[PDB]
Design a protein around this ligand. Structure first.
Ligand code: SF4
Ligand code: SF4
Ligand code: SF4
Lengths: 301, 373, 89, 177, 176
């Protein structure tokens, strides 16, 4: 009953900071090309609008359950990564679990985008799945480079091995995995260079081309959690937060600073770079970040 | 029962934000195109049987809306054509004013084409900057003549409102020197990155024999090997005393037809800087006092006239015929994009991927109010 | 009293410090600078060192404040923060 | 219950970018780095479900009034169109057109009209600001007249061009494949 | 003739050169906060009409040069310009012989869906004392008529101004 309230604390904090992180993305992309743009508390009002309609669509019996499964999977992703010391479980937060549970949101946001039935949703799913094909070639090598440099997989036995000694973006056989993660994060998010699972403008909107009221609200929740989960997975592995309430709140605050830190370098790349053809997106994630992560993988062994 | 079972027909209709207002039905084959016919005419106001009912002077304001991005090139061609059938004596001051507004609307249309390209090429920063720097040109036009766009300015003889003076002519020097220092920050976002160069490379290969006989008249056949600039070949306004240099490439893929428009922006801004240091001498803004009054009853002697003028997308002509009364018997406004993104687009999308259907659509500067007329 | 006037002087120095940089009028900023030199001289004297108090009196009251407005004479007087067509560009 | 959603509507009006022909030269720079709309939260996205602010920018061809009313049939609750320019009011300068549709209120329910040709973005700001004032209390707008008073609009839709467009503008290509 | 390059226009693509588009992370963002920083439009921006009732002769010279056929004539014989079909081209200004049809900078005009607020677009334009509704009454640049009460069989339109005169007059007959 206490782990239930603690998990409710983590999911409601991840909501009320992940939406603010997406609003920070909107604010920085507004200032990146000379505009005030929205207030900081903007996508909260997006979600609050999208649950206030009076009609919906519901094309099929599976059209509901796919995106609801996407929200359940993206909540399951953030439940294992150690959000500060307050973790509902730290015994098993293994690398392969969190790495695969980022991809399952890219199922359910697309598995229920297929049930509508559209050439726009079909070619959006066509251009979304080649990413998830191509991005796992430098992603797996980054995970092996994290693996063989430490040995342990329980993610509480990694932040302990960071706060004992050293940082983790240092020690160059592990830094070459971080550049591979810094490039794969824009694809795993849906930011502008490797945008194409969102693609606003070239195709209509790809997978989320016609969802409706409540379904777009669940998508905004899922997209904010995908943001927060992949950013917390990058920070609790390659950066390490680790660490009384005046110690715990400051621990979560410096964790939030390192959340913004990779999120800050995810935006500066992700506005000055145009959208990528999916035929080149399959060709790019095998040339440069694969050989970088492969040099990191043979230098971690 | 779905009777194709092989080729799915997605089609970019009006509400798509890549194409502006003309639907291209694409017989897609997985991720390529095997047949790309277009259905234009979502905007057919009509101007043949609609501009035949207004008098000769008031048929300016109705004729502006044939091309939206350039709100001066459609009036400045009809004002050049009714100049010919009556045979005025348009002075040096009106010629200079019409020259400078014909070149500043052209740099506005280039800036709008950059913003329209960047809104569909993903990168928004080159879109927001291009619209921001188009807005100060709009706010500079507003001092002169009237509204932002559709400034009904160039009546068939001369203009309607002269310059305000040193508050205005010094201001154009300021914004042109500013944007000439600014233009080196458009290259790094739109023309120097290895994304765009790797995105528009080799797509829509236009041949050399495929441009001159096809209907193409713009700056985009000039990226193919063709030496034809209507400002250079037959100068009309105060063009011969400018000495600008035109770009010609031997290429013909899509990014060849984009770098040529970037260089046209550079040399056209150099034109407006070169034209300003001349400065207009004295003179009237109107042409004549006696043969202009009773402004509806404006009997023009019969005959016909053709005029044609450079645009952002295509050297597009007008065709006025005068029966002899106060009615244009037929004013035809040839849209620049009639065979310039309708017919040449059909043999340009065959084989191209879906990601380069919108980029090819903007690499010809397709403006849907010109096909319909 | 003893410590209450000390708290009065030190909070007066702080409120003349914050309001020395909030203003846009630079002559007013020299006024705020002179008042800061006032409360610094009084605090030097109240902390029982008269040498620094009279030196800072002869330096900060009319050789640091009266050299600064002496420099804004042939310079700006406002922030000049500007309504307008081509403004804030 | 109700004002927790009512304030939420007037802060994130998502506009769909139809760009209806003549008028898509003051639809973009309305929503760019100058006089803007993202400060009001007006974020554009091209989807017929994820919008609640349709801008009928100028004239409407009947080869586009099919597409506009099909887009208007898909926004679920808070669809209210903002008529623009001076075309929807009485017909613009194309009152002498067999195509350009006069008197837009007889076809789809307009909420608010602006004037201008083209309307300056300050006038669009005044239009949206009056639309915010209208949507505070909530003022029986469009989506509340397209539902109960459907018998009049469906009759006026079918009288102009009519006879089931879902067979006329669908069978118009299957011989010409 | 005067071909500019041989390969001078075509530039070289580049990896990390787009970071020079990142320079405006710290400069002042170039926007105008419209509630409430006003813009002050041009001194001769084309706007609404300010007919003078003492110089108008009713010669319908404007009637035949309106491109959108909305300057139709009434009797007590002045014109009513409707902005239903009007492009603000201001050809009726420099063609009016007497000079009794001016234009002043006023463009903001927003009306709602109901017909009683849509009779607002049929106004016989008032004297240039409406310039004392552009200045001296809260310089908002909006249409200073703001409601019109037509009445069938007792045709007496009432331009209920901002706080000034109700401006009653009868309208009987149209055309010529
Ligand atoms: S309102 Fe004016 S500018 Fe807009 S479409 Fe109609 S005629 Fe063109
Ligand atoms: S304002 Fe322009 S369009 Fe309207 S009646 Fe006058 S001249 Fe004609
Ligand atoms: S404004 Fe001119 S044309 Fe119109 S009624 Fe008066 S005098 Fe006649």
């Amino acid at each position: 009953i206490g782990v239930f309230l603690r998990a409710l604390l983590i999911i409601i904090y991840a909501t009320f900071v992940g939406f603010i992180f997406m609003g920070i993305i909107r604010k920085v992309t507004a200032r990146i090309h000379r505009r005030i743009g929205p207030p900081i508390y903007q996508p909260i009002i997006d979600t609050l609008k999208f649950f206030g309609k009076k009609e919906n669509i519901t094309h099929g019996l599976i059209y509901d359950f796919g995106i609801i499964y996407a929200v359940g999977a993206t909540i399951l992703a953030l439940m294992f990564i150690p959000l500060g010391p307050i973790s509902v479980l730290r015994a098993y937060g293994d690398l392969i679990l969190v790495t695969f549970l980022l991809e399952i949101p890219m199922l359910g946001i697309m598995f229920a985008a297929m049930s509508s039935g559209n050439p726009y949703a079909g070619i959006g799913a066509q251009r979304a799945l080649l990413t998830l094909l191509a991005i796992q070639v430098p992603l797996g090598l980054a995970i092996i480079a994290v693996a063989e440099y430490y040995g342990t997989f329980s993610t509480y036995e990694i932040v302990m091995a960071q706060q004992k000694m050293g940082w983790s973006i240092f020690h160059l056989p592990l830094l070459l995995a971080a550049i591979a993660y810094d490039i794969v994060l824009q694809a795993m998010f849906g930011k502008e260079p490797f945008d194409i699972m969102i693609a606003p403008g070239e195709i209509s909107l790809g997978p989320m081309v016609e969802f409706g009221g409540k379904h777009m609200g669940m998508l905004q929740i899922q997209h904010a959690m995908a943001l927060f989960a992949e950013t917390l997975f990058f920070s609790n592995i390659f950066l390490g937060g680790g660490v009384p309430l005046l110690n715990t709140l400051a621990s979560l605050a410096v964790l939030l600073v390192k959340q913004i830190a990779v999120l800050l370098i995810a935006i500066f790349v992700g506005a000055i770079f145009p959208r990528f053809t999916i035929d080149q997106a399959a060709k790019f994630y095998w040339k440069w970040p694969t050989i970088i992560a492969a040099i990191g993988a043979i230098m971690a062994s | 029962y779905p009777i194709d079972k092989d080729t799915y027909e997605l089609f970019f209709g009006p509400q798509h934000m890549a194409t502006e207002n003309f639907s291209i039905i694409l017989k897609m084959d997985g991720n390529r195109v095997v047949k790309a016919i277009a259905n234009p005419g979502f905007l057919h106001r009509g101007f043949e049987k609609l501009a035949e009912y207004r008098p000769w002077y008031t048929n300016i304001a109705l004729l502006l809306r044939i091309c939206v991005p350039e709100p001066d090139v459609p009036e400045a061609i009809y004002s050049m054509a009714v100049d010919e059938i009556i045979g005025w004596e348009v002075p040096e001051r009106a010629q200079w004013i019409r020259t400078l507004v014909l070149e500043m609307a052209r740099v506005t249309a280039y800036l709008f084409w950059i913003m329209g390209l960047s809104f569909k090429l993903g990168v928004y920063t080159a879109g927001q900057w291009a619209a921001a720097y188009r807005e100060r040109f709009m706010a500079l036009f507003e001092q002169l003549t009237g509204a932002r766009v559709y400034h009904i300015y160039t009546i068939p003889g001369g203009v309607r409102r002269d310059i305000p003076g040193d508050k205005w002519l010094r201001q154009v020097r300021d914004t042109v020197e500013y944007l000439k220092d600014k233009l080196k920050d458009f290259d790094n976002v739109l023309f120097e990155n290895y994304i765009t160069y790797k995105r528009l490379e080799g797509i829509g290969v236009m041949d050399k024999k495929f441009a001159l006989e096809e209907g193409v008249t713009g700056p985009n056949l000039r990226a193919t090997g063709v030496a034809y600039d209507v400002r250079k070949s037959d100068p009309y306004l105060l063009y011969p005393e400018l000495d600008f240099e035109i770009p010609v490439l031997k290429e013909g893929d899509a990014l060849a037809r984009v770098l040529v428009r970037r260089y046209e922006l550079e040399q056209d801004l150099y034109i407006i800087e070169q034209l300003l240091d001349m400065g207009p001498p004295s003179g009237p803004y109107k042409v004549q006092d006696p043969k202009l009054k009773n402004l509806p009853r404006f009997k023009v002697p019969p005959g016909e006239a053709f005029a044609h003028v450079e645009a952002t997308k295509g050297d597009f002509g007008a065709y006025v015929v005068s029966d002899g009364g106060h009615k244009p018997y037929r004013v035809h406004i040839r849209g620049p994009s009639i065979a310039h993104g309708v017919r040449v687009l059909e043999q340009l999308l065959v084989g191209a991927r879906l990601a380069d259907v919108p980029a090819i659509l903007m690499s010809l500067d397709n403006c849907p109010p010109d096909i319909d007329r | 009293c003893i410590v209450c006037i000390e708290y009065i002087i030190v909070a007066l120095m702080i409120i003349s410090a914050i309001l020395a940089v909030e203003w846009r009028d630079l002559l007013a900023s020299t006024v705020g600078m002179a008042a800061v030199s006032l409360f610094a001289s009084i605090l030097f004297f109240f902390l029982q060192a008269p040498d620094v108090a009279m030196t800072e009196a002869a330096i900060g009251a009319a050789l640091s404040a009266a050299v600064f407005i002496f420099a804004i004479k042939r310079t700006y007087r406002y922030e000049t923060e500007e309504l307008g067509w081509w403004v804030r560009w | 219950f109700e004002p927790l959603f009512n304030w939420a509507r007037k802060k994130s009006l998502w506009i769909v970018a139809f760009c209806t022909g003549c008028g898509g030269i003051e639809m973009p720079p309305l929503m760019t780095a100058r006089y803007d709309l993202e400060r009001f939260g007006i974020m554009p996205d091209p989807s017929p479900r994820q919008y609640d602010l349709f801008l009928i920018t100028g004239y409407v061809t009947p080869k586009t009034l099919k597409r506009i009313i099909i887009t208007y049939e898909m926004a679920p609750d808070p669809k209210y169109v903002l008529a623009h320019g001076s075309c929807p009011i009485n017909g613009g300068i194309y009152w002498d057109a067999y195509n350009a549709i006069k008197q837009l209120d007889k076809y789809i329910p307009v909420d608010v009209y602006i004037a201008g040709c083209m309307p300056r973005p300050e006038a669009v700001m005044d239009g949206i600001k009056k639309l915010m004032e209208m949507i505070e209390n909530g003022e029986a707008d469009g989506w509340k007249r397209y539902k109960e008073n459907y018998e009049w609009y469906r009759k006026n839709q079918d009288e102009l061009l009519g006879e089931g467009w879902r067979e006329k503008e669908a069978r118009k290509w299957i011989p010409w494949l | 003739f005067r071909i500019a390059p041989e390969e001078k226009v075509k530039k070289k693509p580049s990896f990390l050169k787009p970071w020079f588009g990142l320079k405006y992370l710290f400069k002042k963002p170039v926007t105008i906060k419209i509630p409430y920083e006003f813009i002050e439009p041009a001194p001769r921006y084309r706007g609404f009409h300010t007919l003078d009732w003492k110089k108008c002769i009713g010669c319908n010279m404007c009637g035949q040069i309106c491109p959108a056929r909305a300057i139709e004539m009434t009797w007590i014989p002045h014109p009513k310009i409707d902005y239903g079909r009007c492009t603000f081209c201001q050809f009726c200004v420099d063609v009016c012989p007497t000079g009794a049809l001016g234009f002043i900078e006023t463009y903001m005009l927003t009306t709602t869906w109901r017909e009683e607020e849509l009779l607002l677009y049929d106004w016989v334009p008032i004297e240039p004392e409406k310039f004392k509704e552009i200045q001296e009454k809260f310089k908002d640049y909006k249409f200073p008529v703001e409601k019109i009460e037509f009445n069938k069989e007792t045709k007496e339109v009432t331009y209920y101004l901002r706080d000034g005169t109700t401006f009653k007059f009868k309208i009987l007959g149209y055309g010529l």
